Amino acid sequence: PWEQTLKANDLEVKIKSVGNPIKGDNTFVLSPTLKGKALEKAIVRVQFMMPEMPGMPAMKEMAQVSEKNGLYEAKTNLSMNGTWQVRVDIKSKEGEVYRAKTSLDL
Amino acid sequence: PWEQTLKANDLEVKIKSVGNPIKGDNTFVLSPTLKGKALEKAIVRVQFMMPEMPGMPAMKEMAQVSEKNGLYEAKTNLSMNGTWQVRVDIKSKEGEVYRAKTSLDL
Ligand SMILES: [Ag+]
Ligand SMILES: [Ag+]
Ligand SMILES: [Ag+]
Ligand SMILES: [Ag+]
Numbered sequence: 226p227w228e229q230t231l232k233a234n235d236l237e238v239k240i241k242s243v244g245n246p247i248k249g250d251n252t253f254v255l256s257p258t259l260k261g262k263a264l265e266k267a268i269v270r271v272q273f274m275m276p277e278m279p280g281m282p283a284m285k286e287m288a289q290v291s292e293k294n295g296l297y298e299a300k301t302n303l304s305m306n307g308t309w310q311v312r313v314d315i316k317s318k319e320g321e322v323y324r325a326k327t328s329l330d331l
Numbered sequence: 332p333w334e335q336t337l338k339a340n341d342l343e344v345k346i347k348s349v350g351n352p353i354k355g356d357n358t359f360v361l362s363p364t365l366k367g368k369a370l371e372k373a374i375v376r377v378q379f380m381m382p383e384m385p386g387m388p389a390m391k392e393m394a395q396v397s398e399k400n401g402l403y404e405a406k407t408n409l410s411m412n413g414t415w416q417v418r419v420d421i422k423s424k425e426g427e428v429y430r431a432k433t434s435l436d437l
Binding site for chain 1: 335381384385386387411412413414433434436437
């Protein structure tokens with residue numbers, strides 16, 4: 226199952242697909258940590274984007290994010306195969322802002 | 332079956348996959364024409380590339396290309412799914428150079 230660990234100094238964000246990523250409805254779980262400590266009650270946004278291509282417009286999907294105790298479930302529908310750019314935006318409960326990027330080659 | 336017609340002024344290049352494109356060995360058939368006339372005995376090169384991006388280093392494959400009577404068969408191995416950029420370079424028998432580009436989602 227697809228997973229990437231994103232590192233930005235003291236910020237680590239593991240993002241893992243729940244099951245294998247598919248065309249259709251997808252669930253990913255993100256575990257953002259600062260010096261290994263879970264970021265709870267954070268604003269977590271996850272965007273999946275495909276640039277414009279022959280026969281299709283640029284596509285942007287914002288995931289629906291829910292938290293349980295520092296684990297964030299990001300639900301999205303990926304309507305087609307191909308490369309999706311993944312952008313993770315985090316505002317901690319303390320107000321610090323972080324961004325991290327990866328990619329999903331579906 | 333994936334299929335596209337690339338138009339570049341007086342150049343047209345029809346390209347069609349053999350079967351559905353997916354990870355592994357892939358075959359494409361290319362039919363280049365200049366003002367409707369088949370381009371025979373040309374040098375046809377086809378590059379498949381996934382650009383460098385967050386979480387994936389750049390990947391590049393050059394297809395093995397053969398001609399029979401103006402039809403060019405391009406064989407390549409695409410080791411992962413996702414979006415592949417397709418670049419077609421043609422040097423006609425007369426010495427004219429052409430370049431056309433598209434992409435396909437695996
Ligand atoms: Ag798309
Ligand atoms: Ag696409
Ligand atoms: Ag790749
Ligand atoms: Ag990629």
